[PDB]
Design a binder for this molecule. Structure first.
Ligand code: NAI
Ligand code: NAI
Ligand code: CXF
Ligand code: CXF
Ligand code: ZN
Ligand code: ZN
Ligand code: ZN
Ligand code: ZN
Lengths: 374, 374
């Protein structure tokens, strides 16, 4: 009943920074060639979405944010071959065009068609499918999931198992996959190893999940909020430390705890100081540190390159290093096959209309992931 | 005739920074338990030794520097089992104790007994074997090869082929192995890849050799001194670029030349800016950059962590990542079997007494490696 026609629906619009989201009616255009229009079913609140509100992350405003989600295809544009109406899907914030150098590389996932490096906030063709009170509204990472309906490019969507629990697997859209893959794929955590994880939110908990799956012997969680320790230990942490409890810098503490430094470290917060600290706490000759957290826009860190000269490996990744379109369906299948759990990450479930409350929860430290249901 | 007796010989003493070395008589004590006294045959002039003079590399003064060398064992102390008098040997600036956690790790090489991290300028026991004008003189990285005789700890010396040409294989003690290993072992350059090498001195040329051995398709040499291009090409560079020849930053140039960034980049100079430039020029999603150059003492670099977040891997290494005592004999055997060449690095030969002229040659940009003969 809506194919080919503009849909008027409810979405959460962010008109400017540091304001609450505005719940109102937007118009969503029909998909054009190689485009897919999706009816949202569930969406998670990730810290990345909050970064747009706080100014940590810069992307054109006004925008319909949201990128961790799942839904059902309402309609497809001409030339689409990978999904069909009625299919359960997950929008991919990192696309997989399959044609670029990165997509063709065995170890690359940061497809050149991404909207991250040089944020435009549109569709692949340079325009937007969203309007609110007569104004054009920007897209976010080619996803825009805080809406009852969205339109995405074909390369930014994956078809998933028809029997999937959308209220759970939306987390495969960002948080879980990012953390899990950062450990198992990017760091390539080894059996018997010692790991340190900075940040115990949804993404950090997922990193822990990965470290445990990889066979780590010790997994030290680090967070200034002690309230996040019980959940970390439930999912695999062997020890948790709060930097504020110590008189000395935490890198020193961790080095002592690990009898000379950890094998693998992970920055899952988004702070410059913690990125340097995490590098420092890994063993000087063979240690590996992975940056996951997003830094505040345009800001540079300062470090001594002797930390690397001795032998350390420092790397970062988007979406856990997973080639998005290939991996997402695979991950959903693994979850259906009980290979990992998602429930430990879900602390709150709210209706979409309560998005602001959901963000309040995140900002207060009370939640891990709030799932919004449409 | 000299066993168990103090040896009086000539050495090049550095009394203070930024002055010429003083060639004069020193007193070399006999080796203590697990110590080896070596009659030096040949030693190379590496930039790192110049860094001691310039204050770029901080180690206690007065000192007998020099660390890329080869000689013959004069005597051994009690308990030495790995070398015997008359053996040809190469001193190891990076030790291999074989007992620490790093030595036991499959990838690690920066043995915890090293004198680089917290320089003491002594033997393993905290004392010196050198006296000059009645004053104790410091050791350098446990080697001190700018002397007719030196004393080194057993874990800092390797026995090599009795037939080795010491005037050539002394380079396996530093320069060649560092560069070669940085490409083949640390970066693990792949067949068909595009590489960029910043710095075309002895070490950078060795990096090029390694890249070529590894099968790289393109090897782009970068240096502000064009006079260093011909030899770079000889050893394998496919292209050479002088950053001063351009209006753009060389990272932009290199990115354009490589159609999106290089596979592998190497910083083989020792500047904070080029370490960042080198990182920036490798592919944002799958690129790898290796720091080999030594940065000015206690200086911090500035960089945007988004360079890592996209997928880059940044790492550094000492001595090309080679476990020193295991690797050095092998490298010599390979050299003997013509697996790599050393002659392209040797531009000048001088007698030890002309150490200062050798340093002048390095500083003037005229030489690659000057080999000093005793
Ligand atoms: N690389 C990627 O592809 C992705 C990056 N991210 C980034 O990962 C980070 C984490 O995301 P979420 O788990 O959703 O965030 P979150 O806010 O739920 O978790 C962050 C945790 O860090 C802790 N923390 C804050 N300051 C700290 C400090 N100084 N020391 C120690 N702990 C501290 C907080 O208490 C909190 O538990 C964010 O920066 C997010 O933007 C998110 C997903 C994708
Ligand atoms: N990591 C390790 O184990 C080792 C590190 N090193 C370090 O490696 C570096 C290279 O050593 P060598 O080859 O002996 O030195 P070198 O001085 O012969 O070569 C350095 C080259 O860099 C070039 N250069 C200088 N400034 C430049 C700029 N702005 N842009 C481009 N090129 C520039 C010079 O013209 C020169 O050709 C030194 O810093 C040295 O201390 C050396 C040995 C072992
Ligand atoms: O959280 C989802 N995506 C993130 C990935 C890292 C850069 C900011 C956006
Ligand atoms: O050049 C030989 N050794 C170097 C290794 C890197 C730190 C300074 C000393
Ligand atoms: Zn692509
Ligand atoms: Zn996210
Ligand atoms: Zn050791
Ligand atoms: Zn050297």
């Amino acid at each position: 009943s809506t194919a080919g026609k503009v849909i008027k629906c409810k979405a959460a619009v962010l008109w400017e920074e540091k304001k609450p989201f505005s719940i109102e009616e937007v118009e969503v255009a029909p998909p054009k060639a190689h485009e897919v229009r999706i009816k949202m079913v569930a969406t998670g609140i990730c810290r990345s979405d909050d970064h747009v509100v706080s100014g940590t992350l810069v992307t054109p405003l006004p925008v319909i944010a949201g990128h961790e989600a799942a839904g059902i295809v309402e309609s497809i544009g001409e030339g689409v071959t990978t999904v069909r109406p009625g299919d359960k899907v997950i929008p991919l914030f990192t696309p997989q065009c399959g044609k670029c150098r990165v997509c063709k590389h065995p170890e690359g996932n940061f497809c050149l068609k991404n909207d991250l490096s040089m944020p435009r906030g549109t569709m692949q063709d340079g325009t937007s499918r969203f309007t609110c009170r007569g104004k054009p509204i920007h897209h976010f990472l080619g996803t825009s999931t805080f809406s009852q309906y969205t339109v995405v490019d074909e390369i930014s969507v994956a078809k998933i198992d028809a029997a999937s629990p959308l209220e759970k697997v939306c987390l495969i859209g960002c948080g879980f996959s990012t953390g899990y893959g950062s450990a198992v794929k990017v760091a390539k955590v080894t059996q018997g190893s010692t790991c340190a994880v900075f940040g115990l939110g949804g993404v950090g908990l997922s990193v822990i999940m990965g470290c445990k799956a990889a066979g780590a012997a010790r997994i030290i969680g680090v967070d200034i909020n002690k309230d996040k320790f019980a959940k970390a230990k439930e999912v695999g942490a062997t020890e948790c430390v709060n930097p504020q409890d110590y008189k000395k810098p935490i890198q020193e503490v961790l080095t002592e705890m690990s009898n000379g430094g950890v094998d693998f470290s992970f920055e899952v917060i988004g702070r410059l100081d913690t990125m340097v600290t995490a590098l420092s706490c890994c063993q000087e000759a063979y240690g590996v540190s992975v940056i996951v957290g997003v830094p505040p826009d345009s800001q540079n860190l300062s470090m001594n390159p002797m930390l690397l000269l001795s032998g350390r490996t420092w790397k970062g990744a988007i979406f856990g290093g997973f080639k998005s379109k290939d991996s997402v369906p695979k991950l959903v299948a693994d979850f259906m096959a009980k290979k990992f759990a998602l429930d430990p990450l879900i602390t709150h479930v709210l209706p979409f209309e309560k998005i602001n409350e959901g963000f309040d929860l995140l900002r207060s430290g009370e939640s891990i992931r709030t799932i919004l249901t449409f």
